């Protein structure tokens, strides 16, 4: 009851859940010690946090922070430190423990000594393109973020199919404007315009035959996150697989 | 088998001077300051052999000569050719294409209206322009003396509405450029702007509504245009509706003073009335400035 | 127009809108008319002066009524010699009940009347001594204006020096804040995802209350989100405030606050009170 603490956990896409703990001197404790300190004419407190650490599991391992941290001391403040946990594909929820050491130094070198230790579970409170029909999956083997200029470049698809008939699909980019509140109308027009002529495929209408190298050239500068022009058509039972993957900046 | 025509808007600064069209188009842009960018259109046509041996397939335009490609046996290889636009006011595209004979009556009650005839004349005479300069002069790699030419007349089939927009700007409704004084202006300064407007020969199509409404939109160079409250942004006198008229060389000159940042692009929009969904032309001249 | 008071500082209002070439506006609350003024601060701090404006205007009803009078029934001076110079006030009393359609007058039409009465107006003109040399023109003009539409051209040609412009005014006292601050921070982003190429905003805004605080929002990122945790070091210059954040994260919500209105305040150091918090993440 001197510094209220909370922990926030987020799930990054790079298979590393990041959990950040936040500490803040609570206002009720602030006024509680503040009137008794201002009786002796003190305006700013001094809670010296000298040893803050987090532990892992039933065997205690000290996972470090993401940056440096000295031994600080301040009043009426808040500070947050972020550790990087490991992403779990199973349903084993990791339970961690944190500990601090607040030295509540009253003045003229007459200090008290306080320590605290919480322990809880680091929950989070709740791409590979796959089709809807068959076993056919898509994933770009080369890193989906890429930094290019407006020059010629290459990109690499990959197909994991049912081995019964691996062939009979075609790719094409469809360089035409999709046929569409004037402000939202023109915003959707600018999205559909810079999609339809931003990059151009240097081999479209292209029969596939488990790799498939397909080669572009990029014209217009900008970050094309989930570049969604190119559209792999499946010949038999005529449907379309969108490929919402890959993101190329062109600067 | 197929063909498509796409324009370009980036300037293509150098060290990308290895790709065959880029040096020619940037050479024409580079000197001759009236020979500007933003109006070049690339045509994308795909050569595909049905043979057993490789070919070389050099493409000659009226002055553009491409590199030496290599199509092996059954593949496509999209050879990208630059071409400028064709000016509507300099030319005439509303005359009937002639027949060869003068003998037959040819069912002289022709079953066509006015506007269907005129769009048929446009669709024919645009490919009449783009065929009468295009060539190719091929050779086999393993035989080297079997060099022949090709035609293009039995290959290009027809156009659609997208090709006649992209090749011919006379199909559009207005012709606009922009004039800006200083593209590197400091923030405490107000700069006059200019929007020239020059209507088309498709102004005959409506003939009744003698006003159209030039909207103004503003977008951060990245994405996601700014709502017209324009705080932290361009501080602007007047309002962005600015009525213009048919058959007029009007100039809706405005003023613009920045607040925070640099990367701004300016463009227009034509909407034919003031209500929702009256829109006709999403005009896209889209010039840029900076504020340090 | 805009006018500067008698205190007479170096206020440089570069903004001054003159609608010389257009005699046109509309205020039907569909689009948004914004006027703006690029003023300047004084030679020192100056927080309470008085500004008064000058809007000339008209209303569009008597704009189209002036157009209809000057080019529908009194175009030439031949009819203006006799047929309307003896019944001008009667023409105004007839014109005041015209009630032209101002709902389709902003969409491809101008000077177009609504469905108002035109039957008993002929009987009302016939009741007085109105001669047929004017009763033909005053009926034919209303019959023409019952279904006609003009354009934006030849509107200023009727509006030119034929309208009393009510040059109204207002009062704008150029309101000010209370607690001046001057801070500058610096960041160093420990990258979770490599860089998301964020777009920046160096704010300048002051909080004006008592027992209050200054709350800041981080920069805006537009690539792959939820990441790029930015570390920071304060160097909170020229004051002694209270800080309430350390080594935040540039995702969905960070809100790196700074409790300001507690101790070590100052006066109005400028036109308003300021806090020119310029972060610099290099």
Curated annotation (Swiss-Prot), chain A:
What is one process in the GO biological process aspect for this record?
Answer: protein-containing complex assembly
In terms of one coarse class, where is the protein primarily found? cytoplasm
User: Domain of life of the organism in this record?
Assistant: Eukaryota
Q: Where in the cell is it found?
A: Cytoplasm; Golgi apparatus, cis-Golgi network
* A GO term from the CC aspect: TRAPPII protein complex
User: Sorted alphabetically, which keywords does the UniProt record give?
Assistant: Cell wall biogenesis/degradation, Cytoplasm, Golgi apparatus, Phosphoprotein, Transport
Its biological purpose:
Specific subunit of the TRAPP II complex, a highly conserved vesicle tethering complex that functions in the late Golgi as a guanine nucleotide exchanger (GEF) for the Golgi YPT1 GTPase. TRS65 plays a role in the YPT GEF activity of TRAPP II in concert with the two other TRAPP II-specific subunits TRS120 and TRS130. Involved in cell wall (1-->6)-beta-glucan synthesis.
Q: What else is known?
A: Present with 1660 molecules/cell in log phase SD medium.
Task: State whether it acts alone or in a complex, and with which partners, per the record.
Answer: Part of the multisubunit TRAPP (transport protein particle) II complex composed of BET3, BET5, TRS20, TRS23, TRS31, TRS33, TRS65, TRS120 and TRS130. Interacts directly with TRS120 and TRS130.
Q: What is this protein called?
A: Trafficking protein particle complex II-specific subunit 65
Species of origin reads Saccharomyces cerevisiae (strain ATCC 204508 / S288c) (Baker's yeast)
Q: Which residues of the full protein are shown?
A: 212 to 559 of 560
Curated annotation (Swiss-Prot), chain B:
Q: Where in the cell is it found?
A: Golgi apparatus, cis-Golgi network
Q: How does it assemble?
A: Part of the multisubunit TRAPP (transport protein particle) II complex composed of BET3, BET5, TRS20, TRS23, TRS31, TRS33, TRS65, TRS120 and TRS130. Interacts directly with TRS65.
Q: What else is known?
A: Present with 259 molecules/cell in log phase SD medium.
Entry's family note:
Belongs to the TRS120 family.
Q: What does this protein do?
A: Specific subunit of the TRAPP II complex, a highly conserved vesicle tethering complex that functions in the late Golgi as a guanine nucleotide exchanger (GEF) for the Golgi YPT1 GTPase. TRS120 plays a role in the YPT GEF activity of TRAPP II in concert with the two other TRAPP II-specific subunits TRS65 and TRS130.
Protein known as: Trafficking protein particle complex II-specific subunit 120
Q: Which organism is it from?
A: Saccharomyces cerevisiae (strain ATCC 204508 / S288c)
Gene symbol? Answer: TRS120
Curated annotation (Swiss-Prot), chain C:
- Source organism superkingdom: Eukaryota
Q: What are the subcellular locations of this protein?
A: Golgi apparatus
> Which cysteines share a disulfide bond?
none
How does this chain assemble?
Answer: Part of the multisubunit TRAPP (transport protein particle) II complex composed of BET3, BET5, TRS20, TRS23, TRS31, TRS33, TRS65, TRS120 and TRS130. Interacts with YPT31 and YPT32.
Q: What does this protein do?
A: Specific subunit of the TRAPP II complex, a highly conserved vesicle tethering complex that functions in the late Golgi as a guanine nucleotide exchange factor (GEF) for the Golgi YPT1 GTPase. TRS130 plays a role in the YPT GEF activity of TRAPP II in concert with the two other TRAPP II-specific subunits TRS65 and TRS120. Required for both the cytoplasm-to-vacuole targeting (Cvt) pathway and starvation-induced autophagy through its role in ATG8 and ATG9 trafficking.
Identify its protein family: Belongs to the TMEM1 family.
Q: What else is known?
A: Present with 432 molecules/cell in log phase SD medium.
Full protein name: Trafficking protein particle complex II-specific subunit 130
Q: Which organism is it from?
A: Saccharomyces cerevisiae (strain ATCC 204508 / S288c)
Gene symbol?
TRS130
Q: What stretch of the parent protein is included here?
A: 803 to 1084 of 1102
């Amino acid at each position: 009851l001197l510094n209220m603490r909370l922990r926030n956990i987020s799930l990054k896409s790079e298979h590393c859940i990041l959990s950040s703990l936040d500490f803040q001197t609570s206002k009720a404790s602030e006024q509680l010690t503040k009137k008794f300190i201002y009786p002796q004419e003190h305006n700013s407190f001094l809670k010296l946090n000298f040893q803050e650490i987090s532990y892992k599991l039933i065997d205690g391992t000290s996972q470090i922070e993401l940056d440096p941290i000295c031994p600080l001391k301040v009043p009426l403040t808040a500070f947050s430190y972020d550790s990087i946990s490991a992403t779990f594909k199973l349903v084993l929820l990791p339970k961690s423990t944190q500990p601090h050491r607040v030295k509540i130094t009253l003045a003229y070198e007459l200090e008290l000594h306080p320590n605290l230790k919480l322990p809880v579970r680091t929950s989070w409170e709740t791409s590979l393109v796959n089709s809807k029909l068959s076993n056919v999956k898509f994933k770009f083997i080369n890193s989906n973020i890429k930094v290019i200029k407006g020059e010629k470049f290459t990109m690499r698809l990959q197909i994991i199919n049912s081995s019964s008939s691996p062939l009979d699909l075609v790719v094409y980019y469809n360089n035409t404007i999709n046929p569409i509140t004037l402000e939202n109308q023109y915003q959707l027009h600018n999205k559909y315009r810079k999609i339809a002529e931003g990059i151009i495929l240097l081999s479209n209408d292209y029969k596939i035959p488990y790799f498939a190298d397909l080669r572009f050239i990029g014209i217009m500068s900008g970050y094309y996150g989930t570049l969604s022009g190119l559209k792999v058509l499946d010949l038999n039972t005529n449907e379309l697989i969108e490929v919402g993957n890959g993101a190329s900046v062109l600067i | 088998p197929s063909m498509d025509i796409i324009p370009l808007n980036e300037l293509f600064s150098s060290q990308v001077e290895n790709v065959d069209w880029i040096e020619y188009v940037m050479s024409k842009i580079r000197a001759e300051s009236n020979l500007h960018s933003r109006d070049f259109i690339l045509l994308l046509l795909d050569f595909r052999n049905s043979w057993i041996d490789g070919i070389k397939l050099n493409v000659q335009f009226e002055d553009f000569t491409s590199n030496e490609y290599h199509v092996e046996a059954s593949h496509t290889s999209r050879i990208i050719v630059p071409i400028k636009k064709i000016d509507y006011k300099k030319y005439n595209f509303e005359n009937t294409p002639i027949p060869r004979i003068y003998p037959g009556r040819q069912f002289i009650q022709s079953g066509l209206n006015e506007e269907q005839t005129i769009e048929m004349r446009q669709k024919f005479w645009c490919r009449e322009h783009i065929i009468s300069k295009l060539k190719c002069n091929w050779k086999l790699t393993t035989d080297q003396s079997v060099t022949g030419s090709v035609d293009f007349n039995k290959f290009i089939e027809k156009f659609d509405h997208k090709m006649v927009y992209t090749i011919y700007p006379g199909r559009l409704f207005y012709g606009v450029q922009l004039l800006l004084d200083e593209p590197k202006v400091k923030v405490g300064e107000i700069i006059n702007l200019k929007i020239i407007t020059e209507p088309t020969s498709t102004c005959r199509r409506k003939q009744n509504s003698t006003v159209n409404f030039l909207d103004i939109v503003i977008f951060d160079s990245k994405t996601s245009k700014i709502l017209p409250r324009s705080n932290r942004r361009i501080l602007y006198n007047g309002s962005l509706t600015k009525p213009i008229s048919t058959t007029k060389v009007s100039e809706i000159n405005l003023e613009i003073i920045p607040i925070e940042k640099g990367r701004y692009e300016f463009s227009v929009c034509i909407s034919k009335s003031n209500n929702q969904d009256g829109i006709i032309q999403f005009d896209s001249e889209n010039v840029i400035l900076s504020v340090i | 127009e805009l006018s500067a008071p008698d205190t007479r500082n170096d206020y440089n209002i570069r903004g001054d809108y003159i609608a010389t070439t257009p005699a046109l506006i509309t205020f039907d609350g569909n689009e948004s008319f914004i006027n703006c003024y690029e003023i300047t601060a004084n030679n020192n701090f100056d927080s309470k002066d008085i500004f008064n404006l000058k809007v000339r205007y008209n209303t569009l009803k008597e704009q189209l009524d002036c157009f209809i009078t000057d080019a529908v029934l009194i175009e030439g001076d031949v009819e203006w010699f006799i047929l309307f110079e003896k019944w001008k006030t009667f023409w105004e009393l007839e014109i005041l009940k015209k009630l032209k359609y101002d709902y389709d007058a902003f969409k491809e039409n101008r000077i177009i009347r609504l469905l108002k009465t035109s039957i008993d107006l002929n009987k009302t003109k016939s009741k007085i001594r109105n001669l047929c040399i004017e009763k033909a023109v005053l009926d034919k003009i209303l019959i023409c204006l019952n279904k006609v539409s003009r354009g934006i051209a030849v509107c200023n040609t009727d509006m030119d020096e034929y309208v009393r412009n009510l040059v109204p005014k207002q009062l704008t006292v150029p309101v000010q804040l209370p607690g001046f601050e001057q801070f500058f921070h610096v960041q160093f982003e420990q990258m979770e995802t490599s860089h998301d190429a964020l777009h920046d905003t160096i704010a300048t805004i002051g909080n004006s209350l008592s027992y209050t605080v200054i709350v800041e929002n981080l920069s805006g990122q537009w690539g792959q989100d939820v990441i790029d945790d930015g570390g920071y070091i304060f160097e909170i210059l020229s004051s002694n405030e209270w800080l309430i954040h350390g080594q935040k994260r540039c995702a969905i919500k960070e809100k790196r606050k700074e409790f300001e209105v507690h101790l070590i305040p100052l006066k109005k150091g400028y036109l308003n009170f300021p806090r020119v918090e310029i972060t610099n993440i290099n």
